[PDB]
Amino acid sequence: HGWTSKGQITVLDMHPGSGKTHRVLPELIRQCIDRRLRTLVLAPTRVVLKEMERALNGKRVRFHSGAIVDVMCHATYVNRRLLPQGRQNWEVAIMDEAHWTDPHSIAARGHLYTLAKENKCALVLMTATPPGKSEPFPESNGAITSEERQIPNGEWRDGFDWITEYEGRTAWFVPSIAKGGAIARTLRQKGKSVICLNSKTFEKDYSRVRDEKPDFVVTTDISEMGANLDVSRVIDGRTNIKPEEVDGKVELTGTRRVTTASAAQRRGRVGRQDGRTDEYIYSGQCDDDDSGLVQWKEAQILLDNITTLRGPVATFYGPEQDKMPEVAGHFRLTEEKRKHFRHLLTHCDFTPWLAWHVAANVSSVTDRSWTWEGPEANAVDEASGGLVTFRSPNGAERTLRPVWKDARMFKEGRDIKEFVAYASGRR
């Protein structure tokens, strides 16, 4: 009765240096291929999928963009299950970097957990910070000196000489793309090479880190899911952006303290070379209560729409179930509305929150009046001056003013011009 038995859940929590990708994953897959089990492997990012492809060199595996092993991203798995026909089951599921609080990652591990509890598959979660109780300063075979210092929260001129006098390469974690922009401006002004990694740039620019060896990588939490930045120092203000639903709108004002699992992953970027002691420089405390974030509602929206009313009630993975904001099934859509939802998610780059509000409520898929018929206060500032305006296909001038306002559609990685392409009926 081993790890590939239907209903077994294994958590592999090993640190860097224990052979996870190059020794442990290829052995897990060899056993699955030997036992002729249909096997699913989930990577968080295409970057990690490329590493797996190298580690699984010379095995019979299908990588998504004869084989009984399928390797794909967390998000690809969820987006496939939103299709009527995308619902074949695997007998063994292995999820890498399974701590990610991206909504698709939460719903993926919730779904696989639900199947494993109904004895439909075996589940392996691989993460150094399994969901549940975390420690901020885990001991490993890595050497890390952790020290608390005041850290700039934006541009600085004088002081903080320890930042620029350090010899060797740094990863600086920032709460948002905007804050990262500020830090990168000052670092470049002071003669340092900088690469910015975030939701928008990670998949394209991660490879530049190995190639260019910049003095600083200025990174959002995107780097907490398997990024090997080859740095000797982490700078960590221990903050993140706080997307939350307030008065029926998604807001992006100010910040929250990172979870302990997040602080541990940020610290976890260093300590990778046996024999070398690295630095983790931090400011302030962690906060484990992230239950107020819109990510839990978004993950329930996805999980509700990749399970059936007939199939028994789905849950988030073990301890995350306390953070499911409504009774399971609450956000389930009709086939017809789920087709609209999936289109907005996959073709229009909508957030789950906004794709759900639109698909659930709008009179028809080809209506765009919801983008200008909202309350006055839902307008968007235009960089060039005034409020954002566009022309409908009928040629009428509109002021962008959506019925459902999600601030994430207008900054933090997304351009207003892509949303105006939707609203103007060009997408």
Instruction: Tell me: do 147 and 247 sit in the same domain.
Output: yes
Dig out the tokens for 122 from the structure: 């075996």
14 is in an annotated binding site: yes
Parallel, antiparallel or unpaired: strands 249-251 and 244-246: antiparallel
CATH assignment of the domain containing 53: 3.40.50.300
Spell 15-41 as b/e; 16+ CB within 10 A means b.
ebeeebbeebbbebbeebeeeebbbbb
Instruction: Tell me: do 86 and 169 sit in the same domain.
Output: no
126 is in an annotated binding site: no
Dig out the tokens for 260 from the structure: 């302990």
Instruction: Tell me: do 58 and 164 sit in the same domain.
Output: no
Determine contact, residues 116/122, Cβ cutoff 8 Å.
yes
242 is in an annotated binding site: no
22 is in an annotated binding site: no
Q: Report the distance separating Cα 325 and Cα 294, nearest Å.
A: 9
For residue 209, the SS3 value is helix
Give the phi and the psi of residue 121 in degrees, each rounded to 5: -155, 170
**What are the strands, taking DSSP E only, across 132-193?**
143-148, 170-173
Instruction: Tell me: do 119 and 202 sit in the same domain.
Output: no
16 is in an annotated binding site: yes
Q: Report the distance separating Cα 194 and Cα 217, nearest Å.
A: 6
Q: After which residues is the chain broken (C to N over 2.5 A)?
A: 65
21 is in an annotated binding site: yes
Instruction: Tell me: do 19 and 86 sit in the same domain.
Output: yes
Instruction: Tell me: do 176 and 64 sit in the same domain.
Output: no
For residue 78, the SS3 value is helix
Instruction: Tell me: do 278 and 176 sit in the same domain.
Output: yes
Instruction: Tell me: do 82 and 211 sit in the same domain.
Output: no
C-alpha distance from residue 172 to each of 148, 169, 264, 359, 398 (Å):
14, 10, 14, 39, 41
For residue 195, the SS3 value is strand
Q: Report the distance separating Cα 211 and Cα 33, nearest Å.
A: 35
Instruction: Tell me: do 89 and 216 sit in the same domain.
Output: no
For residue 255, the SS3 value is strand
C-alpha distance from residue 174 to each of 56, 203, 280, 315, 409 (Å):
34, 18, 14, 32, 20
283 is in an annotated binding site: no
Q: Give me the domain span that covers residue 108.
A: 9-126
Going by C-alpha positions, the residue among 198, 9, 22 that lies closest to residue 95 is 9
239: part of which helix (H) or strand (E)?
Answer: strand 239-241
Q: Report the distance separating Cα 34 and Cα 427, nearest Å.
A: 47
Instruction: Tell me: do 163 and 278 sit in the same domain.
Output: yes
347 is in an annotated binding site: no
Q: Report the distance separating Cα 171 and Cα 234, nearest Å.
A: 5
For residue 52, the SS3 value is helix
Instruction: Tell me: do 108 and 148 sit in the same domain.
Output: no
Q: Report the distance separating Cα 43 and Cα 227, nearest Å.
A: 12
Method of structure determination: X-ray
Instruction: Tell me: do 149 and 275 sit in the same domain.
Output: yes
Going by C-alpha positions, the residue among 91, 80, 158 that lies closest to residue 122 is 91
For residue 133, the SS3 value is coil
C-alpha distance from residue 296 to each of 95, 97, 202, 366 (Å):
19, 18, 23, 29
Beta bridge partners of 324: none
Residue 175 neighbours by CB under 8 Å, 6+ apart: 220, 237, 239, 240, 241, 255
